[PDB]
DNA sequence: TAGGGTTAGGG
């Protein structure tokens, strides 16, 4: 049994009559569900807009993150790696992006070690080892760009990543402006 | 579209 928070998707964008009924009802297509939820207002009962679906296993959770786009009960939803309460407190944990910041990697990485690490998330576009301007110098960090945003997601809900030999710190990537802002 | 009475004691 893996960990409960890895089993769970974030199911945004829900349509305002969906119910814990249909939500299950939908996504059981992919697995066995071990909880499934519809959060409404705590005094009007209103749905929030927003759920979230458990499964058994990751792989189910995998399935079902393969079978995108989804639509219940007539509404395009959105699906997403559930992240920890502790984590959601951070700047942007909740955006959908492509790009990751990898912090903490030695000055002789290359490209192939990031590869040999963050290919088996999903497809890479783009990889960029940072370095001083003019300076040349090896500046300690780099940022990789998939082709999904779910591979960003299944890659920063994990607490630990080696690159080149060693533990590195993967957070996703904010803009210049998003960084000053939560600064 | 980010969580359900789900987060620092008392020795």
């Given at each position: 049994?893996?960990?409960?928070?890895?089993?769970?998707?974030?199911?945004?964008?829900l349509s305002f009559e969906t119910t814990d009924e249909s939500?299950?009802?939908?996504?059981?297509q992919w697995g066995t569900l071990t909880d499934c939820v519809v959060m409404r207002d705590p005094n009007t009962k209103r749905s929030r807009g927003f759920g979230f679906v458990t499964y058994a296993?990751?792989?189910?959770?995998?399935?079902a993150m393969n079978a995108?786009?989804?639509?219940?009960?007539?509404?395009?939803?959105?699906?997403?790696?559930?992240?920890?309460?502790?984590?959601?407190?951070?700047?942007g944990a909740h955006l959908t992006v492509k790009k990751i910041f990898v912090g903490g990697i030695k000055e002789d990485t290359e490209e192939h070690h990031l590869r040999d690490y963050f290919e088996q998330?999903?497809?890479?576009?783009?990889?960029?080892?940072?370095?001083?301007?003019?300076?040349?110098?090896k500046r300690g960090f780099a940022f990789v760009t998939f082709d999904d945003h779910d591979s960003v997601d299944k890659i920063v809900i994990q607490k630990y990543h080696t690159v080149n030999g060693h533990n590195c710190e993967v957070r996703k990537a904010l803009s210049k402006q998003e960084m000053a802002s939560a600064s």
């Open positions: 049994k893996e960990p409960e928070q890895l089993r769970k998707l974030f199911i945004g964008g939500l299950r009802s939908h996504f059981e296993t990751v792989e189910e959770v995998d399935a995108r786009p989804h639509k219940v009960d007539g509404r395009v939803v959105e699906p997403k790696r559930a992240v920890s309460r502790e984590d959601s407190q951070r700047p998330y999903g497809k890479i576009e783009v990889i960029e080892i940072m370095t001083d301007r003019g300076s040349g110098k």
